[PDB]
Ligand binder design. Sequence first.
Ligand code: K5C
Ligand code: MG
Lengths: 556, 412
Amino acid sequence: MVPISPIETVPVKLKPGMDGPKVKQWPLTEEKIKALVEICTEMEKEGKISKIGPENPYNTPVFAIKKKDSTKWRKLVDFRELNKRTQDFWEVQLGIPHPAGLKKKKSVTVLDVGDAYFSVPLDEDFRKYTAFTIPSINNETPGIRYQYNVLPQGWKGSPAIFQSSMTKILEPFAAQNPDIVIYQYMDDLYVGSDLEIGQHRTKIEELRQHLLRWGLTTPDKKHQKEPPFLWMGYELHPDKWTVQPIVLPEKDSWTVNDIQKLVGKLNWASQIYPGIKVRQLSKLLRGTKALTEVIPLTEEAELELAENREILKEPVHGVYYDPSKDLIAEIQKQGQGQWTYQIYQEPFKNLKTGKYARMRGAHTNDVKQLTEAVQKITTESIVIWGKTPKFKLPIQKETWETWWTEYWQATWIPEWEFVNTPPLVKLWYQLEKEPIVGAETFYVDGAANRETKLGKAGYVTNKGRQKVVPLTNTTNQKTELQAIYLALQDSGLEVNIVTDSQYALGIIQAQPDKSESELVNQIIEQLIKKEKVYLAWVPAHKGIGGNEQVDKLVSA
Amino acid sequence: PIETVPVKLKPGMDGPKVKQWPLTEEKIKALVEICTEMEKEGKISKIGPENPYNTPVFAIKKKDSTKWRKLVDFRELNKRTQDFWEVQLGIPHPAGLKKKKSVTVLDVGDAYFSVPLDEDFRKYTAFTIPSINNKTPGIRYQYNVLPQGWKGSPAIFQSSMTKILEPFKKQNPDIVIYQYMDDLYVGSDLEIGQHRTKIEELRQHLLRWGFLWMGYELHPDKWTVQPIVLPEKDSWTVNDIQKLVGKLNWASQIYPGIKVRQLSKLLRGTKALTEVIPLTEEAELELAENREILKEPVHGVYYDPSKDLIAEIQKQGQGQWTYQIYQEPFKNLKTGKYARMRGAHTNDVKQLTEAVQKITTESIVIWGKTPKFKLPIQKETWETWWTEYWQATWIPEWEFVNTPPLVKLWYQ
Ligand SMILES: Cc1cc(/C=C/C#N)cc(C)c1Oc1nc(NC2CCN(Cc3ccc(S(N)(=O)=O)cc3)CC2)nc2ccsc12
Ligand SMILES: [Mg+2]
């Protein structure tokens, strides 16, 4: 007998105030009982469970299931009730590495640690909560009652406690073997290195020698999977990675459920297939909850899908990470608020790709969206590689300088260079800081009757030019924008405009280049056509000349 | 200090469960070395999966220091930790601190590591050194001693600190010492040379009671509410008068008796913006009367310790930032301006982060608490970058302004 170290137990508690489960066991057929006695008798001989007396007041229902070809019954303890009452744990397995962040390894071995799992003891003070009952034949004897001594499969804490217990056992081995990498996934332990196959096979045996200190046997994974590893939806090849096959189905009838499955595939593929777009296919889902509802594809959604079929026609792959090379991120504008990007170290050899979609908003402009995309890529790159990439952006250095020196918010984008890849991001208009000498001055105003929705918009100028237009089904804010629109339409290439609308000022001072409001868009089109525009604000109803004159014009 | 002080959370509240944000490789490496040494010294310990709580951590560099420092973002734990009246019913904030010619800030946070933390509360201080790309599980720790930045730390240590300082305070009854979180604020009305003498005369006293050697020099002499000023011109265009009427109309929300009628009269008609308008005597008098009004202080302004302080900030361009601190709109308790932020002539976000720290320092000196910031920046830009320029051991609260305030003009 070689002494083995005990795996340190994790203390477990129930949620405050809650007691253990007390769920009634279901009646079972004679055949299922016979199976469960047979199964539990074996688990008992292996130490997994133990018989208990009738003083324990807790119980969890047990079942007997089977497979079609598998000529055996399967035991099943339904721990749903106990899980509701068990404390929360640190779930230390939610996120998985991204392949583009891995460095290639010459050799990789897989170990099966399925049997190691059962060597993890369950906190003894908690075992009582796991009691279950095998009903007896004909209910003529007391049922056989057991409790677990090991982490039950299906119990809330088994995944976190198991992985934590392995990590702590492996830590000294990883720290003292920095030339290997160890990664655990389910019952699988993945060991890679750049050692010659000889030294690598030795580290593996040393790892086995180490695990034996806790009595943990670990053979190889049954039917050793050849490359690529089918893992978390990827194909991990020795020198390259890609996503698993992306196959878009052919259909003449697309439902609300079909479109959800297509965006999911497209989204998954966008991490390596560059230029994927999902707006027009997403728009067909704006607001609905019946998945079988059929939604016709717009000629814009068909185009988007066909553009994606073109991208998906041939497989692509990313390279693994080389810490000695620079990390570079390039962004392109696609239109309709959509952005794509590539991250790479050598030209034409992408580590990964991605996309970014504009946020929902009544107004916006391309520079703000580009800035947001940069922040998203920055954060992703820190996650994957632990560093910010150098950016190549389709915006002139002088355009960016003008933007951030004049924009009313603080803004920042990290080290970057211009890449002359149309369409380029640009500023479409810039308002003057001072009034323009010799330019006509338009005093604008608008007003609308709340009840009738009738309104007026117009202007008066220092040259005696004047206009008032009657409007139907409008609002104060709408007439205020319409008045600015009329002044732009009726003025020369240089114009001073005086408004009292804080709402209109707030919109234009945000420097949008597109809007959900068709009226704002028309104003933007006019601004783009001007040489100089000065926009001034005055308080309403204060007797300011020009403003007082036009106010009475549009107020009935 | 064998005996720990019983610490609890507020009723019906669980511990914090705040996500750790991603860190660059060099910051993770710094944290690993720092926490390894802290673990060797018993200040923290590894925790197991039965602890589900978490508080974010990151790494910084104190003002002009090349050594990495750990900073824990305890904002969530602090608001979940019980309100404290550890020794007395409260610490009357020293109104004289803000009056001292000079005020020096000493980092005494290292003293906390000498007091053990209540064993039952330790689990709530859990934090994670993250891995890169999820390649390994984060390193999970919890505190064994009073942690820096936690609300309970100054409260629990206060009995010790007050005894450490008594001999020094005994000799210097005119030196005002105030503590906020990890920092001591030491102010005096002395000539700058004489003031500095005692600061070193204060840390050596501290070093013999069990340090850092870092300082910070303030001058609250010049902190107030900046007056609203109006232009003094010999010729006014239509545009100038429109801007003046707009500013005065804004000011009328703050000051009673502001009038613009005589000034608006000058704008009778529909004139070109660049046309020069001569002021009448009636408008000159009105402007003079407005100017007189603006010299006096705002009526009915008072600090209410039960309400939050609010700080607004405007980007004025060319490295200049204006700010106002208030509790109720138009009742500014203090206003100010910043120029040429140090080492950030081309980075808005660094400049804004430095402004936030300066405003917070002023708020601590004047009221003993931090304000809630209204930041002229999009959330995603601020949240990506602010930790890169943070150098303080506290962190305030903030919200984001997405619509340009018209009043940026009026504070220009
Ligand atoms: C070691 C490991 C394996 C997997 C696979 C799961 C499945 N299913 C997943 C992760 C996250 C792993 O974890 C780490 N993986 C790496 N790198 C990899 C190593 C593997 N190759 C692919 C490959 C190479 C050689 C052969 S081969 N010639 O042996 O047949 C087959 C496949 C890409 C890079 N680096 C680290 C660092 C810390 S953890 C960790
Ligand atoms: Mg009007």
